[PDB]
Every structure is written in C-alpha cells, then in structure tokens.
Design a protein around this ligand. Structure first.
Ligand SMILES: *[C@@H]1O[C@H](CO[C@@H]2O[C@@H](C)[C@@H](O)[C@@H](O)[C@@H]2O)[C@@H](O[C@@H]2O[C@H](CO)[C@@H](O)[C@H](O)[C@H]2NC(C)=O)[C@H](O)[C@H]1NC(C)=O
Ligand SMILES: *[C@@H]1O[C@H](CO[C@@H]2O[C@@H](C)[C@@H](O)[C@@H](O)[C@@H]2O)[C@@H](O[C@@H]2O[C@H](CO)[C@@H](O)[C@H](O)[C@H]2NC(C)=O)[C@H](O)[C@H]1NC(C)=O
Ligand SMILES: *[C@@H]1O[C@H](CO[C@@H]2O[C@@H](C)[C@@H](O)[C@@H](O)[C@@H]2O)[C@@H](O[C@@H]2O[C@H](CO)[C@@H](O)[C@H](O)[C@H]2NC(C)=O)[C@H](O)[C@H]1NC(C)=O
Ligand SMILES: *[C@@H]1O[C@H](CO[C@@H]2O[C@@H](C)[C@@H](O)[C@@H](O)[C@@H]2O)[C@@H](O)[C@H](O)[C@H]1NC(C)=O
Ligand SMILES: *[C@@H]1O[C@H](CO[C@@H]2O[C@@H](C)[C@@H](O)[C@@H](O)[C@@H]2O)[C@@H](O)[C@H](O)[C@H]1NC(C)=O
Ligand SMILES: *[C@@H]1O[C@H](CO[C@@H]2O[C@@H](C)[C@@H](O)[C@@H](O)[C@@H]2O)[C@@H](O)[C@H](O)[C@H]1NC(C)=O
Ligand SMILES: *[C@@H]1O[C@H](CO)[C@@H](O)[C@H](O)[C@H]1NC(C)=O
Ligand SMILES: *[C@@H]1O[C@H](CO)[C@@H](O)[C@H](O)[C@H]1NC(C)=O
Ligand SMILES: *[C@@H]1O[C@H](CO)[C@@H](O)[C@H](O)[C@H]1NC(C)=O
Lengths: 162, 320, 320, 162, 320, 162
C-alpha cells in the first residue's frame, strides 16, 4: 500500500524510532519521476503534426461515388486515429505505473544494501533495525551515508539473541 | 524497537485509468488528452471573419435574389457559412452551372468587390424594366435578381446584341449571365419577337453557345420557365464578347476577385460570436493544444485529430 | 538437506512467436489475431438478401432485355452482385446515361416495385408493335426491351407526341426512356416519316432535349443504329412531360423506389448461399471479432481492417 | 529452464524434502498473469472501431484519375494497418515475455526474503535449507507465513561445520 | 584489497537521441531511419526511361506542334516528365478534349508507334496544303500541327467527305481529329464554301457529332478562331467513320498503343541523368531501404513513407 | 558512470588486483545485446510494406473539389506516419536504454552469486574481495568457474576480523 501522510513528494521514507516518527520524501528520485512523466505527456502532445484542412460536403446528388470515396477516407482515418490513440494511452499507462514501481524498488534496494544484516527485512517494505537508530542515524540512511561498522556489533549480538 | 520503511504518495483522488493489462485502476493524478469542449460559436479564422449567409444560398447572394437584400459589404472572408436549407436560392427556377466548383472557388477570398460593368441605361434598343416575376418578389411586389438583367423586346423588336467588356481592372472578374428557357412559341415571340434564338459568349478561353429549350415543364415557384446561369473568370487584360437575339439574361454587376487560398462551405445554424479561432466546427470553435478531439468531423482550420472516444486519460501519478 | 525451488510452466507446444528483438521464440500458448477464413458463400447482409443478377447487367435487368425477363421481385436488397461480364446488357447497342451513378443509387434499395405508367394501348396514333429487332431476340425471334416501347410511324405519319405522367404514388419513381440514332435519311423516313426530330423531357428539375445523330457507325450485335437511354427520379407530386416527333423510345413501365441507405456493386461469380453475415467479400462472408483480416479488399459491411500478413500471433504463455 | 511437471499453473514451486517431492503452482500470481494477458488480448481486439463500408470499383474508363485516387487511399490504409499490426504484435510479445520473467523473479524474491541465512541460494532458482523442512514448513514458505525464528539456531549450527 | 567491477562501454560519440521521458540523451551508437538524400537527377524507373518532353506539352507532342518537330521514337516509357509551363502546346489555340484522362492513359506505355493512316495525297477533292497559320510556324513560315490536316475547299467547293479507316493492326490505335471554329460567315465561306457544317464520327462505341461555333472571341497567338480536338482508341478490328462538309481537321497519323500499366505525369525542370531507380522525385531519385523519407511528396515508384521530420534516430548503443 | 577504458565490448569487468588492473568485456551478454538491438532496427525497417504509387497533380481548374479530396488524403497519411514514426522512435529508445540497464544488472547478479560472502558488495557495481584474487582468480570469475571452496576460510577469517 501507499501513504496518505507523505505530502512533500512521490517516493520516500517513514521512520519509527525513540524521538517520534515521521515521513520524509526522497527529493531527487521524486523530481526524476516528475520530469519523466512530464516529458512523456508533452511528447505525446507535442509530436502531433497539425495542418490546415477544410472539411465539407461539396459533392452533388450525381457525384455520390466520389462522396463515397471521401467517406471511406474520413472513416478510415477516424479508425486509424481512434485505435492508435486508445492503445497508446493503454500502453503508456502500463509503463508509467511500472516506472513508479521501479523507482520505489530502487529506493528499497539502495537502503537494503546499506543495512545488510544490521536490520531485518520485514517483507512489507519495512526494515526492522537490530539496534538503536536515532534521528541522525535515520537521516544517514536517507542520504546514503549510513555507516555499517558503527552498529555491527550491537546488531551482531541482538541477532544471535534470536 | 527501531524501524525504517520505504513508501509512496497517496491521496483521495478517485481518478481512474485503464492499462493494457488492467482496467479501472485508481490513481493519484491523471491527465485527459481528449479535447471535448468548444465555445458554442462561429468565429473568425486566424483573424478573418466568415461570410455568413443566413437565409441565402451562395447562388442567391451572388445573383442578388431580392430576398438577399442584406449586403453588408465583406471585402474578404476565410470561409462561408450556409444554413442546411437556405430559403432564398434561385427565386426564378433553373440552374447555376458548375455551382459546386464556384462555391469552392468562393469559399475563401482575399478581395471581393462588386462593380457595375454594363449599366442598365446602356441598353437603348431593348426593354430593361419589364423582366420581373412574381417568383422573385421584393416587398411583396414582382422583381428579379439584382445583378443581372432580363432583357425584353422593345417596340416589337429584339435586334441582335453584340457587346464586349474589357477587364481594365487589375483583378480577375467573376462574371455571370444566363439563358431563359421559354415555355412555347407564343411566349417566345411575346418576350423576344425572334422565334429561333441563341447566345454566344467568347473570351480568350471561353467559347460558349446557348440555345433555349422551349418545352413543357412542371411549375416551380409558380413558373414553368427556367433560367440557366453560367460564369467565367475574365483575366485582367481580356475581353468577353456577348451576342444574342433573345433569351439573354445579361450581366449588369460583376465581381473583382483576388484568390490566394482555399477553404470550403460550412453548414451551420449558429451565430457569429465576435471571437477568433484556429479551428472552427459547425457547432463551435475549438481552442486547444490537445492532440485529439471528439467534437465534430466537419472542421475547418488546424485541428486535433478527430476520434471516436469519450476519454483519453493518461496516468501521471501512482496507484491509489 | 531439504530444497525449495521457484519455476514455471512448460509443455510440448511448438507454437512460435516473434518479438521486436527475437525471432522464432517457442512459447507455451499463443493467439492469432488475423482472421484468415471465410464461409465460401454470398450471404444476406444483416438480414437482407442481395440482388443477384446472374447473366444480366443492371442495365439489361432495368430496361428488360428479353433474355432477362425472369422478373421475380426482390422488393428490397442490401447490395447488388453482378458477374464480371454479364452476357445480357444492351441488346440493342448504345448507352445508358449516368450509368455508374444509377448503379450506385440502386446498390441498396429499401422498396422496389415495377408498375405500368403508360400503357401500350394508349398510343393510338403511332405503331407500337413494329419496334423489335434481331438484336433483341426472344427464343430466336425478334423482340425488344420489355419496359420501354420503340414507337414507329403509323399510316405514313408520326404526329407530334405531347404527354405527361403525374406521379400519384407516395414513392419516388425511377423512369427511363431513350433516343434512337438512325443510320441515314431513308431509314429515318422509313421509321418515323419526319426527317428532323427531337425529344423534349421536362419535370420540376429536368429540362432535356435529345436529338438523333444520323451517321455511319460500325455494326454491333448486327446493328449500326444506337439507342441512348436516360433516366430521372420523379418525386411524388411531380409530373414528367414528354414531347417528340420521332426516334422516341417511350416509358411503359417504371419503378417505385424507396432509398434509405447506400452500398455498392459487388463483382462475383458465386450464387446465393442461404446464409447471413455482417461482412461480405466476393469470395465469401467473414464472421469474426478479430481486428484484422487478409481475405479480400472488396468488402461490403462492417469488417476487420484489411492487411498484407499471413500471421499476427500474440504470445499468451511463457517461453518453452 | 522450465518444468513439464507443473501442470496446475504458470508459476510455482518444486519442493524436495523427506516426505517426497512434488510440484505446486502459485495460484494467486498465476491468476494475475492470466487476467492480465487476457485483458491485453481483449484490449487489442476490443479497441478496434469497426464501421460499415462498401468497397467496390465504380469508376469507368474515363475516370481513371479518380480510380487512382482510390487506389492510393486503399493502399495507404493497407500500409498503415499492416505496419501497425505487425509492430504492435512484436512489441507486445516482447512485453508479455518480460512480464512472465518479472512475475517469476518476484516469486523468487519473496521466498529469498523469508529464508535469509536459514538457507543457501544455490543460484539456479533453488534454495538449499540448512535445516529440516517438512511438508507444512514447505507449505508455509509458499503462502508467505514461514517463521524465521523457529529455525535460526538449527541453521546457525549446521553452517560452520564443513 | 582486490576488487572486480561490473560496468559498461563508453566512447567519444556525441550522437544524441530522445526518449519518451528524456531528451538530448547522448549515446554510444545510433542509427537514423529517415532517408534525407537523393541523387539530384531524373532516372529510368526499373530499367525504363521516362518520356521527357522538354518545351512541349503532351498535347503539342501528340498533335505534332511544329515547334516540337523532333519526332524521335521512344517506343516505350515508364512516366512522363513535363515542365511546369511548356512553351509549345496548342500553337493554334483551342482545346483537347478529356486531356487529363488522355495524359493519364499515356503516362506509362508499353509500346507506342506512330503510323500513317490517311496519307495527304488521298484527299483528291479538297485542298491539303493551305491549312496553315502564322500561329503554327515552322522555320518562321506558316504551318500547322503535323499529325493532322486542316482541309480547305478546292476550286470553290467542299464536297461531303465520307471515309472510313479500318484498324488492320494488331494493336489499339490512338486517333485524333478536330473541329475548326471560324469567326464569321465570310471566313466560313472563304475556307469551306458551305455555311452550315458538321462532323460526324462513328466507331463501334463512338457516336459523335461536332458543329462549329461561329462567334466573336479574343485573340490568342494572333487568332480569334479555335480548334477543338478529340480522340478515341480504335480497337483492332473496328473501323472509324468520318463524315463532314467543312471545318474538319482530319487524321493523318495515329499511334499504335499497348498499355499494360499506369503511372502519372511528373512536373520537373530537370533533364535525364543516365541513371536507374525504384523511386523518383521531381528533384531527384531516392535509393534507400529506409522506411521513411522527407525529400518530396510527388514521388513515382516504390518509395519510403513520406513524413515531416528532420531526424528519426534510434539508439543502438548505451548512455555515454 | 560508464568506462572509456573498455574497448572490446558493451558490458564487462574492471579488475583491480596486485598484478595491475585492466578491463575485459563479457562476450556472451554483449553479443546478446548486439543481436537484439540489430533485430530491433531491422524489424522497424523490414515490416514496412512498400508499394508502387504514382503521385502527381492530374486534376484541372474545375476539379478543385477532387483535388482537395486528394490533399486531405495525402496530408492525412503524412500526419499518421509522422506521429507514428516519431513516437515509435521515442518509445523504442526508452526500451533500448532500459534493456542495457537490465543486461548490466544481470551481469552484476551472476557475479554476486559466484562470490556470496567471499566478497563485500561495495554498492557501486564493485565487489571487494575478502581474499587475494590473482589474474587467474579474476579470469575465473569472468568465465563463470570461480571456485568458492578454495577461498572460504581465508575470507571467513578476514571478515570476522571486522
Ligand atoms: C483591353 O483593353 C486594354 C487596355 O488598352 C487601352 O485602354 C482602354 C481603356 C481602351 O482605351 C483601349 O482602346 C486602349 O488600348 C488593351 O490593352 C492594349 O493592348 C493592346 C495590344 O494588344 C494595345 O493596343 C494597347 O497599347 C494596350 N494598352 C494597355 C494599357 O495594355 C487590350 O488589348 C484590350 N484587350 C482586348 C482583348 O480587347
Ligand atoms: C399531380 O397530381 C396531384 C394529385 O392530383 C389529384 O389526385 C388525382 C388522383 C386526381 O383525382 C386529380 O384530378 C387530382 O388533381 C396534384 O395535386 C393536387 O393539385 C394541387 C397541388 O399542386 C392542389 O390543387 C391539390 O390540393 C392537390 N391534391 C392532392 C390530393 O394532392 C398535383 O398538383 C399534380 N402535379 C402536377 C405537377 O401537375
Ligand atoms: C475491318 O476489316 C476486317 C477485315 O476485312 C477484310 O480484309 C481487309 C484488308 C479488306 O480488304 C476487307 O475487304 C476484307 O473483308 C473485317 O473483318 C472481316 O469482315 C469480313 C466482312 O464481313 C468478314 O467476312 C471476315 O470474316 C473478316 N475478315 C478478317 C480477315 O478478319 C472487319 O469487320 C472490318 N471492320 C469493320 C467494322 O468494318
Ligand atoms: C469499470 O467501471 C465502469 C463505470 O465506472 C463508473 O464510474 C467510475 C468513476 C466509478 O464510480 C465506478 O465504480 C463506476 O462503475 C463500470 O460500469 C464497468 O462495468 C467497470 N468495468 C470493470 C471491468 O471493472
Ligand atoms: C523461423 O521459422 C520459419 C519456419 O518455421 C517452421 O514452422 C514452425 C511452426 C516450427 O514448428 C518449425 O519447426 C518450422 O521450421 C522459417 O521460415 C524462418 O527462416 C525462421 N527464422 C530464422 C531466423 O531462421
Ligand atoms: C537539444 O539539442 C539540440 C541540438 O544539439 C546540438 O548539438 C549537440 C551535440 C550540442 O552541441 C548542442 O548544444 C547543439 O545545439 C539543441 O539545439 C536543442 O536546443 C536542445 N534541446 C534541449 C531541450 O536541451
Ligand atoms: C482560449 O482560451 C484562453 C484561456 O483558456 C482564453 O483567454 C481565450 O478565450 C482563448 N485564447 C485564444 C488565443 O484564442
Ligand atoms: C459466427 O460464429 C459464432 C462463434 O462461433 C457463432 O456462434 C455465430 O452463430 C456466428 N454468427 C453468424 C452471423 O453466423
Ligand atoms: C544504393 O546505394 C548502394 C549503397 O550505398 C549503392 O552501392 C547503389 O547505388 C544502390 N543500390 C541499390 C540496390 O539500389
């Protein structure tokens, strides 16, 4: 599931320690997604070539064969654009959602790699520390500087307690 | 015991979105790329006003059907708007030759100016005031198309007309004239004296000969006669040469015309809205950067691509 | 020591599939979205039967070429099927004016009924039994188109015909008539007495005059003469007015017609197959929900999109 | 490679313990893929707008320019639909196969998560337990309820032996 | 302490590429699928040379305008190239009927051979050497279209012509003839004696009658008269039958024609470039396997799809 | 970032040991990417159906309606092919770049699997050995034959040492 709480971004962290809990958005990867999704929409819009045409019904009652020819052309293009537009929206929606997924799983991974066995993968997106992680420790995992030696042993011994 | 979680935004958006593998997926934010709205009005197209004909057809307007007495003098226009069924068309029944190509020619016009080319008072040997009909009333009284003249015999004669008009203007001239198909020999001598008649028309390209078809026909607008009108574009230094001994509906006025671009005739029941647009439809103008629309197929201008959809919604946010 | 593994399905499917980066990838399950099959037959289209003309052209059928007599009614039809080269067409050689627009008009018809409008017996002052030709045999014996009448001089005269027919039916009427182009002055007086002839035809819209072209031509079906046929749609309260002093091929029968939708002419050698479809091709009907097909381009109905492919195969399963 | 023996689904497990071995399909994620792949096919089919047209050859021997105009139109749409259909199939096939891949690697991951060091990633899709995993233990990893504490210590001491 | 790293290639390529979510992404290798170049020349199309008309229109070439006096055999061709405004067209002003359909017919021709069908010397009762005009000079001296003959009265008579030509060749024949529209009664008797004239033309399908329009027209190339030309395809065993008592511009030569295939008329100022191609544009030939191009819309051949782009660049390598 | 130094392939290894350092390309996965990318391009090219057409301007000055019909058809197809081509290139570019990503991350994983705890995931694409890996040891991880047994002990000792 997602977090009604987190309001300052798209992807981020909830930290639960002694000093109280709270949410912090990951700025960089949130911006990456906003840029990318914004480019996607604009590309879909901006790549349309538009030109002047004047569409009417200029053929008379003894020019029905030609009028039919125009009908088949008009209907033809309507069928082409409808299918393309509908499928394009379907396919790019799939990708946009997968893109969010991939961004969140990259966050999770870069944390998982810092923590290693100093914490326990709960399997619901959360990490349960085998040690005491104050508000500066929390901040450190967030900016990629968490230092594994500092805590190994307090964890190595709360781990071999279970 | 201390915990860090990784997560993502959520909100109380109900916006839904389909995917190729999933339907009805609620998301955080979404954007519809289908233009569904229009301003309900007829507008100028890139700064130039349409020619809005109201209860007249292009033919009735051009020939000057006397119920088309509303000549606000538009010297240029970007498209023409006609009602589905103009009430005022060929008051005296008949035809306008190549009518659809003419309309297409006049759909967009850079300069248009009505000028007198053959004054009524120039016809010394023919009657110019008797060619009126209950089929073409003005203010309830019999009249006739105001831009051409239905010449009649004078005294008891119709001497053979031979005239020419040289286009000394710097612009092309749209000229119109017609032939009257009378109903029988008595009417023919009654109107024109000469029983066997013709009209010849010549320019540098045109070489035409019209002969009346004197025959029995059904009544239309009270008349069994018919008038077949014809036209040409007389180039700036050319002359047009007319010759007839009867049944000739002569030019009086004509039109200086400068062309430049093409458009078409729009059928709409709507009203001018003192607005401007890039894209007009017969139910209103479109003002949009969206790539698609579903408003109407019969557009004039640069429009999004017309499709059969209610909804083209792109996800921008996350699952919710 | 115990083991758990994660894995996925496999089977002995040989189905293959291409990818944008890989070819000939064997998969577990697959689905082709190209329609390749049809039922080999000509069918009704949405419940209404086609008009299948067999050895007649639309012209021969309409005019009543005596090798087409066969006049069973279909009072309505959804499309017309004509052979590539119908054998029976204009038995007496010539033309049918605006033929292709006529065929397009008749391609789909909601109500069609032959009625007598001008009985043979009504021609008291002209010969009605001598207009037959070896070019239009019925069982070896000379005859003629059954729906029109080739009028000939009687005694040694052809008085000037002046008749009219009012359409008192509630439906539009398709009416046909013709002009006979004779070969020389002797034949002309031999058949019609009057040397210089014409036909005039008038309605509320029609204003026609036909004149025979008396000249030397090659033989076709044994004849150097020609017959040019013409038609009109006479609206419910209008009348048609004929006048001629010779060379006139007169209506006898005509057709009540109600229009509604549009279709086209299908060229096929097949016969009716007592089936129904949404999508007809000249080699058989298609019954499919697939988005694409490769059967034939000349389809009538609501069909998948025609493409040049053998195979459009989507993977549904896994690599195998 | 893949498994002939698994018949009741698309993705699943082969478990090898004392009580005998056997295959079991992961029901939930198999159903996900069936629904998805089914939706895909139907979307490709159902998004096509179909309309009545009558296609013939109504122009005569002195209307060949107009006949040529129809030809270019017909051939034009044939080119558009052919290219779109062929490429659409190619692209969606790539994705369908990548989707299966991703589903299988999510199964593997959610198992890897539960087991941690209580088992040895053999690196061929299999996990070798450092402890004794009966048919209820096996069933437990399959429905995501496997309990790590229960076995830590038996695994902790089977390790440093060899 | 020992390390192994996993990574990827990089180089000093500046090639850039866009993505749906990112622009101006530098990559290692890239491939443009848009064809942007052409060879600047007019070429054969699949081994057959075009018909390059230079300062003549198709009409002038066909009728033999004496300024096109270059009648070389090209016995087959794949397309026709005309300049935007050929200087030599109808030297004597007038028209060629169905001109555009004729040009379309002649756009691509498998066998074409000019043959004499009615030698000048065969006209014993008419003048064959006086139908020339300052409008059609040859060597500054008055002349005329070389493939047809402007017959004039001889002594003071124009007896009625009745001739026929049977196509005894194995190929269709393109035949042309015309009518002269004189300016007034005096000129009419001066040239043809007979005041009221006609031309009749008959084959197995053709049934034509032409009548001069004696009227006042503007001057073109010094002339107020006009000549209206007509054509037909006379099938291998058919014959054509001409009859006239005046104003007849008779065939002299005609063309054996074998069809097989369609093309169109290209407008280009370029000359032949002694090259071959599958795809010709008016500014040069395209030689490419690419699926798209942006060179010119008016292509003849099998070409990539025309688009409005500068650049269609696919990434092949990695981010750089 | 990517590596100027790697000249003989697309994906590979930089090895840093006693005998000096140096780059080597992974042959197999480089070839897989070249084949795939080559196929992609050829598919986008080869699926285009090309046919003979003759495009001119054969209508006269009183056939402007028909000429307009041709204009709308020509422009129509230009708008269709321009949009489809532009978007196709945009979309396939996204995928080609994601394909490279995925290939590199699979290399990394197949090394991670051979090494396990005999080395330390530095988290920048590099592995820091807990033992001494000469040029033949290095070559062995590259061709997938690295022998974990040989080194377990030396690594165990150097790991517990911190
Ligand atoms: C159409 O008229 C032009 C204009 O010429 C003149 O001015 C007119 C108002 C009138 O007074 C004429 O008599 C004048 O000649 C003609 O233009 C002339 O072209 C001819 C050459 O053919 C020459 O006599 C004059 O010098 C030209 N003058 C100009 C200003 O061009 C023109 O020929 C007339 N065309 C026809 C078809 O009658
Ligand atoms: C064509 O015919 C209609 C109908 O004619 C009437 O009904 C016939 C069966 C017969 O009994 C006739 O004598 C009748 O006249 C004409 O319609 C009538 O005529 C005018 C309308 O134009 C008007 O006086 C009547 O109200 C009409 N009555 C009905 C019942 O329609 C019609 O005018 C004729 N058309 C032409 C072109 O002559
Ligand atoms: C066009 O001519 C052919 C051939 O006619 C014959 O050979 C010519 C060179 C000439 O000298 C003629 O007199 C010959 O008759 C016609 O086809 C022949 O028609 C004849 C006459 O009835 C017929 O008996 C033969 O079977 C045909 N002969 C051959 C060799 O085919 C043809 O009909 C003429 N066409 C027209 C429309 O008049
Ligand atoms: C998907 O939803 C369809 C209509 O959506 C309706 O409007 C949205 C905004 C919601 O309020 C939703 O609950 C409503 O039903 C249904 O009619 C349709 O059957 C649904 N289809 C599927 C396959 O789920
Ligand atoms: C791809 O394969 C094509 C023929 O494949 C045949 O049909 C399927 C159903 C299989 O069962 C297989 O055994 C058959 O051979 C070839 O035309 C084509 O060359 C092949 N592709 C490549 C890249 O070589
Ligand atoms: C994207 O790039 C366009 C063209 O790039 C040009 O060539 C490359 C190698 C660079 O040197 C660049 O500076 C050149 O101008 C730009 O013209 C365009 O403005 C750029 N667009 C964006 C959105 O950055
Ligand atoms: C279209 O909409 C804008 C803003 O929505 C408005 O101010 C105006 O009516 C229109 N703009 C133009 C350029 O026509
Ligand atoms: C078309 O095929 C379906 C599916 O097999 C069948 O049940 C249906 O009756 C058919 N429809 C028609 C109109 O024959
Ligand atoms: C087009 O280009 C090739 C390669 O540049 C050249 O050798 C030849 O002129 C052309 N080839 C073909 C097959 O048309």
């Amino acid at each position: 599931g997602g977090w009604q709480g987190m309001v300052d971004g798209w992807y981020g962290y909830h930290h639960s320690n002694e000093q109280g809990s709270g949410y912090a958005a990951d700025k960089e990867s949130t911006q990456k997604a906003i840029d990318g999704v914004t480019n996607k929409v604009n590309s879909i819009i901006d790549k349309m070539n538009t030109q002047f045409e004047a569409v009417g019904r200029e053929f008379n009652n003894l020019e029905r064969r030609i009028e039919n020819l125009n009908k088949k052309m008009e209907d033809g293009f309507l069928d082409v654009w409808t299918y393309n537009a509908e499928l394009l929206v379907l396919m790019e929606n799939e990708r946009t959602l997968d893109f969010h997924d991939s961004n969140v799983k990259n966050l999770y991974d870069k944390v998982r790699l810092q923590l290693r066995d100093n914490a326990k993968e709960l399997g619901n997106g959360c990490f349960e520390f085998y040690h005491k992680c104050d508000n500066k420790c929390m901040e450190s995992v967030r900016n990629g500087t968490y230092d594994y030696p500092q805590y190994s042993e307090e964890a190595r011994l709360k781990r071999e307690e279970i | 015991s201390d915990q860090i979680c990784i997560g993502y935004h959520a909100n109380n958006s109900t916006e839904q979105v389909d995917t190729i593998m999933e339907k009805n997926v609620t998301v955080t934010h979404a954007q519809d790329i289908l233009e569904k709205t229009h301003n309900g009005k007829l507008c100028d197209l890139n700064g130039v006003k349409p020619l809005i004909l109201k209860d007249c057809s292009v033919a009735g307007w051009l020939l000057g059907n006397p119920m088309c007495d509303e000549f606000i003098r538009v010297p240029e226009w970007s498209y023409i708007v006609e009602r589905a069924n103009p009430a005022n068309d060929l008051c005296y029944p008949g035809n306008l030759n190549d009518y659809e190509e003419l309309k297409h020619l006049l759909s967009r016009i850079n300069h248009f100016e009505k000028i007198l080319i053959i004054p009524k008072s120039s016809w010394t040997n023919h009657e110019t005031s008797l060619g009126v009909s209950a089929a073409c009333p003005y203010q309830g009284t019999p009249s006739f198309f105001r831009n051409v003249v239905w010449l009649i015999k004078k005294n008891d004669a119709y001497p053979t007309i031979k005239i020419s008009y040289n286009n000394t203007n710097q612009e092309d001239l749209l000229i119109l004239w017609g032939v009257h198909h009378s109903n029988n020999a008595a009417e023919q001598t009654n109107l024109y004296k000469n029983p066997t008649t013709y009209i010849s028309v010549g320019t540098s390209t045109l070489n035409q000969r019209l002969v009346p078809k004197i025959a029995t026909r059904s009544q239309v607008n009270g008349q069994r006669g018919r008038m077949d009108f014809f036209w040409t574009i007389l180039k700036p230094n050319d002359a047009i040469h007319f010759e007839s001994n009867g049944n000739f509906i002569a030019p009086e006025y004509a039109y200086k015309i400068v062309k430049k671009g093409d458009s078409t005739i729009m059928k709409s029941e709507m009203e001018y809205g003192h607005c401007n647009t890039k894209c007009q439809t017969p139910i209103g103008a479109i003002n949009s950067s969206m790539p698609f629309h579903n408003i109407h197929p019969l557009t004039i201008g640069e429009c999004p691509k017309y499709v059969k959809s209610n909804k083209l919604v792109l996800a921008t946010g996350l699952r919710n």
